[PDB]
């Protein structure tokens, strides 16, 4: 997380959050994001993850590739196609004030081998 | 005698010495058809810099790694052809009248380097070409030339320099060794050229190492952690930039290796090229069957243990003296459990004791015979959480192979499905996930790091079936 008191129930109904481990990120503007997203209502995942952090994102820490953005400033995206995601990110970043609130839903610790390079 | 650029200058270049070299900075490009376009006006100058930096005619303190010189030499040339003669018109001008050695010493590797990358066009290569044969006694001169008619045969580079290319141009040395490594924990030193494709390098592999065969291997790029294919049309220091760049991307010139192994497993009958099934397929088989990812009895693994410790140690008997190291070499992982320290030694022993009169070679391929018909066998393996399939475990083993995609328990090890390439009707990846859809059917979905790699294998066996 990036604040403490941010209660996921206050803003999303219970279907809407089952399962997902949901905080609160709040990023400082300074420099790019260069946060990558990827998914989206149109793909096969249904919903918005990040594919990369290259860097604004990686300096605040608490996002990686697969945590996925449930909310931008308050919007919620759990419905957004990929280019419109990509669009309020970028919106959100460039327009408005010091920070952006992102909702996240953080990927739980893989129980599996992620890295098997037989062939 | 020695030829210059003077009289080609009156009807091409730009007009203001201007085709003989100079530490001054160009402010428009040399070529007029260059200079013609305005847009064009700052990277050939920005060009021309760091063609003076790499000779050392810049009078700057701060000091540049080659590599990145080198790169903003040749990369917008490779983009926009209409800069690629720009290019050399830059070069042979810093080679005329350079009465300064080093400079013009670093001015042929700058050459060389070009040569390698792209021709002149048709009205510049006569000139070019006199101007090395009048010149042949410079000791990258020949080379230069014979470049221009390779990279004339097979069409120009599509990435700038490889850091292996620049050091032997900054050693002016013209033949390159690349280290190729493979599955037997041995290597090769390979000659390749700026030209040079993947296939190429793989065919005189096959020579080396007296393959039958490689259709179905390629070179593979461990970087990073990964393990890449090479394309086999590529040229293979494109594809070496092209895979470095998109770690970076996807995840300080990078270390790597590149190997020779087997890709695609199709069609393959141990026994019929012994040495690729000795340098190659056992070495592969040998760690997936170690992993536990196949479906063994305890007998089956007793039996196997006996030819792969006879194929590790041949005569060597001792070295079963410590089962707790030894036994992870020789017994899959989900199998050690089955019986004691003791009990593991006692059964290897036995069986090994009935491999006396074999060579290594026919152990190697004894063990591939015994197994080759598994339809585990011949696979790459995945780890994903799948999404898709509540009456499955969360995580589930994926073997990607000549039939498909099967999806395994990774407790029991047995197939909870086989999708075949006959059915399967799509597939798409992203970073975090792997999908695919069978039928009108059945979908599968899953996360993963290692959907390209599906989607490479998945690609290229279906190519190859429809070929």
Redesign the interface.
Known sequence: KYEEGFDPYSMFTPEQIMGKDVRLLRIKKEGSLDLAL??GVD???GKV?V??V?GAAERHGGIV??DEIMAINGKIVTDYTLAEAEAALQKAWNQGGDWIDLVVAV?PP?????????? | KLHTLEEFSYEFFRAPHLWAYSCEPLRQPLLKRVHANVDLWDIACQIFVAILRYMGDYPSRQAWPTLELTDQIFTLALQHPALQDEVYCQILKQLTHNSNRHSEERGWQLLWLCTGLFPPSKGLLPHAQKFIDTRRGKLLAPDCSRRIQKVLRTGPRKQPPHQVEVEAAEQNVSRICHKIYFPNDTSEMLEVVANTRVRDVCDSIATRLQLASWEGCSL?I?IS???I?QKEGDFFFDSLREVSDWVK???VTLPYQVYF???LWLNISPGKDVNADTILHYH?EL??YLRGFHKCSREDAIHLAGLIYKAQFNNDRSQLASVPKILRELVPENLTRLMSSEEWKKSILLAYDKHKDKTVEEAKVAFLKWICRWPTFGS??????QTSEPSYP??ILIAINRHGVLLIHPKTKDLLTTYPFTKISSW?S????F?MALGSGSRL?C????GYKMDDLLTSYVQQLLS
């Open positions: 990827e998914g793909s096969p995942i993850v594919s990369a290259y590739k697969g990927c893989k129980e599996y081998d992620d890295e098997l390079t037989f062939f | 593979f461990k952690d990964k393990v294919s991307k996807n995840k192994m087997r890709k592969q760690p997936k790459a393996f995945f780890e994903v959480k969360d995580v798409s992203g970073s975090t996930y999908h979905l996360e993963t790091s290692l």
